[PDB]
Amino acid sequence: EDLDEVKKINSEMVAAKARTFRDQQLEIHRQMKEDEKAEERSIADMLEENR
Amino acid sequence: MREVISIHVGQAGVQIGNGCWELYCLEHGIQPDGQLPDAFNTFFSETGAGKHVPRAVFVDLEPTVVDEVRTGTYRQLFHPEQLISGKEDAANNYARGHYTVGKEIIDLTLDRIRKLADQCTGLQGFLIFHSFGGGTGAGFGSLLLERLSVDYGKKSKLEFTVYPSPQVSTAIVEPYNSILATHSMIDHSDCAFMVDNEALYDLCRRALDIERPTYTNLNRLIGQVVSSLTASLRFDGALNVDFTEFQTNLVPYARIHFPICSYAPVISAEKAYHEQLSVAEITNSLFEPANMMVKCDPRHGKYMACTLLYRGDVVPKDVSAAVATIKTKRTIQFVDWCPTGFKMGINYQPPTVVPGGDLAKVQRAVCMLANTTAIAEAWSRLDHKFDLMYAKRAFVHWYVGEGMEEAEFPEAREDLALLEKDYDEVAAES
Amino acid sequence: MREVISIHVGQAGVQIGNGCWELYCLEHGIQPDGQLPDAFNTFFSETGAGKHVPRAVFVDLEPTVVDEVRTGTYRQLFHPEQLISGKEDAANNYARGHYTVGKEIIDLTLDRIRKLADQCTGLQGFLIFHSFGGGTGAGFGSLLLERLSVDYGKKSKLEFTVYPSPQVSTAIVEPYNSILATHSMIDHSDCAFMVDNEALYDLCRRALDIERPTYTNLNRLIGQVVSSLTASLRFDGALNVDFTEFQTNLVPYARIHFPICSYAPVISAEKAYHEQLSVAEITNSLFEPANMMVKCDPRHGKYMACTLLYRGDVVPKDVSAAVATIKTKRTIQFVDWCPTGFKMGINYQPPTVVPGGDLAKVQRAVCMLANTTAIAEAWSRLDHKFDLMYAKRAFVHWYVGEGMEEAEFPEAREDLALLEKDYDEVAAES
Amino acid sequence: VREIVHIQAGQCGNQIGAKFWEVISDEHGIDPTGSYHGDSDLQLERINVYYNEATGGKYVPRAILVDLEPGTMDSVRAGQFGQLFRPDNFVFGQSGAGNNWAKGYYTEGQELCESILDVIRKEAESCDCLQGFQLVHSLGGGTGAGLGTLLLNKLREEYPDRILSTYSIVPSPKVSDTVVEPYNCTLSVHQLVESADEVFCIDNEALYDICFRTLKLTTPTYGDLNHLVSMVMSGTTCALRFPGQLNSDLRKLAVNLVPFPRLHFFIVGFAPLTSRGSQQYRALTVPELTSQLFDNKNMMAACDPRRGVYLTASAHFRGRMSSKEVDEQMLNIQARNTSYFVEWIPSNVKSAICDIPPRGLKMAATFIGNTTAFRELFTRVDSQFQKMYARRAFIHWYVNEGLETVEFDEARSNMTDLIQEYEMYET
Ligand SMILES: Nc1nc2c(ncn2[C@@H]2O[C@H](COP(=O)(O)OP(=O)(O)OP(=O)(O)O)[C@@H](O)[C@H]2O)c(=O)[nH]1
Ligand SMILES: Nc1nc2c(ncn2[C@@H]2O[C@H](COP(=O)(O)OP(=O)(O)OP(=O)(O)O)[C@@H](O)[C@H]2O)c(=O)[nH]1
Ligand SMILES: Nc1nc2c(ncn2[C@@H]2O[C@H](COP(=O)(O)OP(=O)(O)O)[C@@H](O)[C@H]2O)c(=O)[nH]1
Ligand SMILES: [Mg+2]
Ligand SMILES: [Mg+2]
């Protein structure tokens, strides 16, 4: 009865980090996508509208 | 060995199934392609060598959702003939799905299912997923069930369908398709579970700390319930429950089959450290109206029969104490003529987690299936919505032009009225 | 085993509790994260891997103070579901917190309290904290107690509230809230302890060299008294005292429950060296009005019931000698119909100091709880202030517009008047 | 698999179509020479819907171009994407447009219709499951207004099952650019009601309003004006071409939005739109898009929906967003403004999501609605036509081509009946 809580606890620590990695990966990708979209709006106005 | 067969119709059925088989592969331990890196016979078929194939059939008139699986990572696992695709949507029209386009493709699906059943020598049962609002889910599903009922006779045809939400509606013709399909299910479905998206959204927002859920999170939660239902037949336990046992005990009559579903503990990762979650805690959470998968308050109605399934390190002693504690609650109403009301089952397989998922890694879990008269509240809402439309004949021209007779609409309306009358009559006491 | 549930309302309740829990954790020896580097059930709850969670619910209509705990050091200790914060505070309005805003959030808190009590199987009573002059403090507390009266019945609902000071005041509408609170408290509360801010301010310099204390220093003094009160249930002692033991002896009548509190010895770090601080000194100094935490002179009133709680090197022989000498004091008067009027309890665990605390590590201490007719002096002042308020209808429009009916003001005035006569009749001799 | 055939009629249709094909060519990533050079494999998943494949990696759109004057084809050929279109598909006349409905319908319509039908029939057999036809024309002059009705009638005769949808431009109430528009539009309405399943009406005055307020164009031109209409077309067909959480094709849209066969005239909207100096400030999210879509100013038809009542409406979203957020926004807007919607049709606002957003935009949405506000547009043309036809001798220009005056009265009678049906269903 006291054994199975170790199964719970070990996955408990590692998958919080796993969710942390997933979220950190997501914000970084959206940051990179934000930079690309910042360039896209730049060429939209600084190039095309200025053209 | 002892086999089950699953059928997925419509957009919702395919996407729900995609999440379901993701859990099954991880729980059973199979590569995305089907190679190994037991109960295998129960869910999968073995193609010789080291490859396995699932016992699933995907059907939709829309090629798009099927092609996503065809070009997906799991494409190698799925046998190409198992993926059936049409050419055009059913236009959310039950007449189009049931009469015009469905009959063009019905024989192709039936032949494959019969071919698949031959390999399932120890088969017992079917599972079909539906979206009531969608034209293909209702129009094709009613046609498929009518054929399967006479093809196979005495086999347990269980269903798991998505009932329309009380307020969140994405289809305007949804009340029409819901009532017509309901007329078909009540006659040819042995036992059909309901869920609604609005309750899932609230549960995914309150219990899980997910601000903006999508269909992906909702599908995974449904898959957990299906796995828990089938866990008794896939793993050892002190109390194994077969599909025949569910059919006998859940339903007290024939037309009152419709059960309700619930699951616990639905908990995020950070809360799992902060709590202990013993057997008493998880048992109490099931009966709270907050955790219910259908947006109906049980306090308005009564309970007819209830079934509980347990997974993990559950001890039969604690289950008996928890059930006794629940019976002492005056807020839970039971009819006089069903004092027992409860069947408990225990299985030793703990829940399986999914990387990047929304659920914790709890030592134990419990599934809740029961029959209640509170489901008649949802029938009243759909009945009222249909009457408003049919009073002015708001959409008759679309359905009649697709080959369905107008006289079918009052027949479906009368059938729903008898069902509501039956639930009120059974809920009565002497 | 044996448990106590703590509920905190308003800025006073939350910020006092924060001082209480820092004392509780260091005394028992649990880290801020809930880990370790007994009687834990009294105020702590246990989770599987050894993480501890307090048995407390923090409730406030303003999220500012609750958020401070959320970002504070102790954020790991409390379960996020126990920290409930509202949207807008009661704005120092009794009617607003009683009817408009409090009823929006009341149902959520009661579920949290009921859910916590299940893990507290050996529950023996509730401790609730309020500010009398505040709007959320008094207004939300009245509704909570009224609900708990029917929810749990015969359970000891002890309270610890800050009474408005005789002269120092930080709220103009303070007399309105206090009397309306007084009406609600006197009916349902089993026994509510009373302290005032002004006497806390005076002793904080008179007993120890602090020239300008803040709310932080005062709250530590409050927590020490609470720790002494609950020390009997927490540690070994020569004379066990339970909550019902206080309840029976302290109150001779239903409506005369309101006791007073005192503590000794309160002494600075250096001055504690010069005095022996024997049993005689701590017992004799308790009766002085300087050490009283309610600014009412006992010489004006009479003594009917006293309770002594000891923690230290206390020997029963010295207790008998000290009490006998006290009865020889002609300055102390007792009602003739109550000759004994003393219950004493001895516990072995000495008080535990706070790193950064403002008290010395005194080897032995004692807590004083008594009920006196001198509190009638305090009541009359509030009655006089209210009559000045209601003679010209100073702030009636604010409270009436929030749903409160105007007829409640004379009814609350009558209830306070009846209490004043009841205290006079009891104090009368025969 | 769900292919679409595109038809462009007249001066207005060809210029709008030229911008329209430039948008889809940019979206899929087709080089002006006709060779694929894009960056994502998803673009080639379902390119068969709008494009045909030629040997050598060259793609040619299913485009049919029709006009009575060759001058419009000269501009189309000289355009940047002129080489993309199939030269044989360029069908044209050799006479003036005439600025007349009867002249286009009777005199030159019969001569051109046989050739146009055969050319379209070529493309009709090059598609397995052609869902329906798409038409671009204006109701003002008579080239597109007159010939488009004849072609639309013939297409319905040949292909009854297929969904016939048109994008029509109505005569502006104040910036009308022809002395005889009310005659042409009134005659065109009769054929539009019975033939086309779905009709989208767009007015130039609303387009000028939208550009000036939001886009702040100092010197707007037709190229800037037609860009917005090209956006609306691209969003409508986005379900067929790309994956989504909830696919919704045209036949889904027709079933939901149309309660009765004659009530099918719709009003369309697009979001987001921002001044190119104000795009820094906008915290563009799902609620921000919902505010723009249902705002009356962003509507491309000069008819205020507030003065009327709403029938069934639908909204299509492009990009990645939460399903719950989209569902809640539609519920909130439907319940907050219950006075606008008819009580006897609950769940008025249909939702749909597609996964891939257009270029540059992280997410975008399109609005299509059905309402009785169309009576105002018909009221304007009816009143003008009454004051036109009161001087009955002005009909003589149409009489020369064989149009008897009794046709005008019958056309108004059918048009008047359409208003009355819209009036009746208000309550
Ligand atoms: N929870 C959940 N519901 C889904 C999902 N996918 C589809 N649905 C439901 O499916 C309903 C609509 O059905 P459709 O998507 O049109 O599928 P269909 O049955 O083929 O309908 P037709 O194409 O018109 O024949 C929506 O109201 C959704 O609630 C999903 O992934 N998760
Ligand atoms: N002794 C002491 N008193 C406190 C402390 N914090 C708050 N108070 C008392 O709280 C009383 C008023 O509290 P408020 O926060 O203003 O009002 P409330 O009771 O929370 O109700 P609201 O009007 O809705 O804010 C004051 O008279 C203070 O004496 C504290 O830390 N120590
Ligand atoms: N928005 C837009 N409108 C146009 C364009 N070209 C022509 N129009 C409008 O179309 C209307 C009539 O055009 P017309 O040549 O008579 O087309 P016809 O009806 O087919 O004969 C005029 O009022 C123009 O304002 C264009 O490129 N863009
Ligand atoms: Mg579908
Ligand atoms: Mg406050």
- Contacts D319 to A, Cβ<8 Å: none
User: Whose CA is closest to B265, among B290, B298, B231, B246?
Assistant: B290
Fill in the amino acid letter for D301: A
User: How far is the centre of ligand 2, averaged over its atoms, from the C-alpha of C205 (Å)?
Assistant: 21
Taking a contact as any Cβ pair under 8 Å apart, which residues of chain B between 139 and 198 contact chain D? Answer: 167-174, 197
Cα(B15)–Cα(D405) distance, rounded to whole angstroms?
60
Cα(C284)–Cα(C281) distance, rounded to whole angstroms?
5
Residue with tokens 């998505």: B162
CA of D204, closest atom in ligand 3: 1
Distance from CA of C157 to the nearest CA of B (A): 24
Q: Considering Cα of D191, then D196, then D198, then D199, what sign does the dihedral take? A: negative
> What is the per-residue burial (b if ≥16 Cβ within 10 Å, else e) of B20-58?
bbbbbbebbebeeebeeeebebbbbbeeeeebbbbbbbb
Q: Which residues have CB under 8 Å from C216's CB, separation 6+? A: C19
CA of C60, closest atom in ligand 2: 20
Is there a contact between C268 and C209 (Cβ–Cβ < 8 Å)? yes
Given an 8 Å threshold on Cβ–Cβ distance, is D279 in contact with A41? Answer: yes
Cα(B413)–Cα(B382) distance, rounded to whole angstroms?
11
CA dihedral (D20, D23, D24, D30) in degrees, to 10, reads 120
Residue D85 buriedness (CB in 10 A; 0-12 / 13-18 / 19+): buried
Residue C245 designated active-site:
yes
Question: Nearest chain A Cα to C51, which residue?
Answer: A9
Distance from CA of D271 to the nearest CA of B (A): 20
Q: List pocket residues of ligand 3, CB cut-off 6 Å.
A: D 10-12, 15-16, 97, 138, 140-145, 177, 204, 222, 225-226
Catalytic site residue from C198, C245, C377, C408: C245
Is there a contact between D327 and D290 (Cβ–Cβ < 8 Å)? no
Given an 8 Å threshold on Cβ–Cβ distance, is A15 in contact with B273? Answer: no
- Which residue's C-alpha comes closest to atom 8 of ligand 1? B12
Pair type for strands B123-131 and B3-9: parallel
- CA C84 from chain center: how many Å? 22
Q: B347: helix, coil or strand? A: strand
Cα(B264)–Cα(B286) distance, rounded to whole angstroms?
6
CA dihedral (C117, C120, C123, C127) in degrees, to 10, reads -60
Q: CA angle C49-C51-C57, nearest 5°?
A: 140
What are the residues whose beta carbon lies below 5 Å from ligand 5 (ion)?
Answer: C 10-11, 134
Q: How was this structure determined?
A: cryo-EM
What phi and psi, each to the nearest 5 degrees, are found at residue B202? -65, -40
User: How far is the centre of ligand 2, averaged over its atoms, from the C-alpha of C12 (Å)?
Assistant: 4
For residue D249 the two structure tokens come to: 């094709």
- Which residue's C-alpha comes closest to atom 14 of ligand 1? B134
Residue with tokens 């309610």: C294
Out of C79, C118, C119, closest to residue B274 by CB: C79
Given an 8 Å threshold on Cβ–Cβ distance, is A22 in contact with B353? Answer: no
Q: D72: helix, coil or strand? A: helix
Residue D100 buriedness (CB in 10 A; 0-12 / 13-18 / 19+): buried
User: How far is the centre of ligand 5, averaged over its atoms, from the C-alpha of D64 (Å)?
Assistant: 74
Using the Cβ of B394 and the Cβ atoms of chain D, whether some distance falls under 8 Å is answered with: yes
Q: What share of chain D is helix, strand, coil (3-state, %, to 5)?
A: 50, 20, 35
Q: Which residues have CB under 8 Å from D330's CB, separation 6+? A: D290, D315, D349, D351
Chain B with chain D: Cβ pairs closer than 8 A: 88
Cα(B67)–Cα(B90) distance, rounded to whole angstroms?
18
Cβ–ligand 2 distance for C90 under 6 Å, the answer: yes
DSSP code per residue over B35-86: B---THHHHEEE-STTBEEE-EEEEES-HHHHHHHHTSGGGTTS-GGGEEE-
CA of D207, closest atom in ligand 3: 1
For residue D166 the two structure tokens come to: 């048109």
Alpha helices in C288-392 (DSSP H): 316-327, 375-391
Cβ–ligand 2 distance for C219 under 6 Å, the answer: yes
For residue C404 the two structure tokens come to: 């409160």
- Ramachandran area for residue D210 (φ above 0: left; ψ -120 to 50: alpha; else beta): alpha
Cα(C307)–Cα(C229) distance, rounded to whole angstroms?
11
User: How far is the centre of ligand 2, averaged over its atoms, from the C-alpha of C62 (Å)?
Assistant: 12
Chain A touching partners, 3 or more CB pairs below 8 A: B, C, D
Q: Which residues pair with A16 in a beta bridge?
A: none
Q: Considering Cα of D143, then D147, then D152, then D158, what sign does the dihedral take? A: negative
Out of B87, B167, B205, closest to residue D331 by CB: B167
Q: Which residues pair with D163 in a beta bridge?
A: D132
Given an 8 Å threshold on Cβ–Cβ distance, is D360 in contact with A40? Answer: yes
Cα(C108)–Cα(C46) distance, rounded to whole angstroms?
23
Biggest CA–CA distance in chain B, Å, is: 63
Q: Which residues pair with B169 in a beta bridge?
A: none
User: Whose CA is closest to D349, among D318, D304, D317?
Assistant: D317
What phi and psi, each to the nearest 5 degrees, are found at residue A22? -60, -45
For residue C63 the two structure tokens come to: 């999220």
Ligand 2 pocket test: pick from C131, C144, C261 the residue with the most ligand atoms within 8 Å of its Cβ.
C131
Out of B273, B276, B284, closest to residue C46 by CB: B276
Q: Which residues have CB under 8 Å from C95's CB, separation 6+? A: C139, C398, C399, C400, C401, C402, C403, C404
User: How far is the centre of ligand 5, averaged over its atoms, from the C-alpha of C78 (Å)?
Assistant: 21
Catalytic site residue from B22, B146, B198, B245: B245
Is there a contact between C7 and C59 (Cβ–Cβ < 8 Å)? yes
